[PDB]
Amino acid sequence: QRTGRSALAVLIRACYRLQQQLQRTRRALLHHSDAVLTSLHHVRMLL
Amino acid sequence: MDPYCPFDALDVWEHRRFIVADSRNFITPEFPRDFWMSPVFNLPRETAAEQVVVLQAQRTAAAAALENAAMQAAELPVDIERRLRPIERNVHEI
Secondary structure (H helix, E strand, O other): OHHHHHHHHHHHHHHHHHHHHHHHHHHHOHHHHHHHHHHHHHHHHHO | OOOOOOOOOOOOOOOOOOOOOOOOOOOOOOOOHHHOOOOOOOOOOOOHHHHHHHHHHHHHHHHHHHHHHHHHHOOHHHHHHHHHHHHHHHHHHO
């Protein structure tokens, strides 16, 4: 009982955290390029 | 063109010791006047208005490139949400 029910826990922990690692990249990479866009608009605002 | 002057010339000799009432003479050069040449100041043809035109044309040309770069960089947020959402769904399939 404890063999197969604990073996799948490794893959469960891997998948339920790979689901969140992509979300973190989704959020962290959007609030950084927006700074690039704001800087570009600021540079144009200098002109 | 001669400046008006009532008096012609006067004379009581120049003893170096007896200098009194220290006035100052008009100091003149020793060269004939003809080469003390004429006053000329010439303008730069590029006018205060003309530099405005040139630099405004440059500003308007640079603004187009700035907008091109912005529109090139404005599509990256669309790329992130177009590429990562299918990957998140594929991970969810497991």
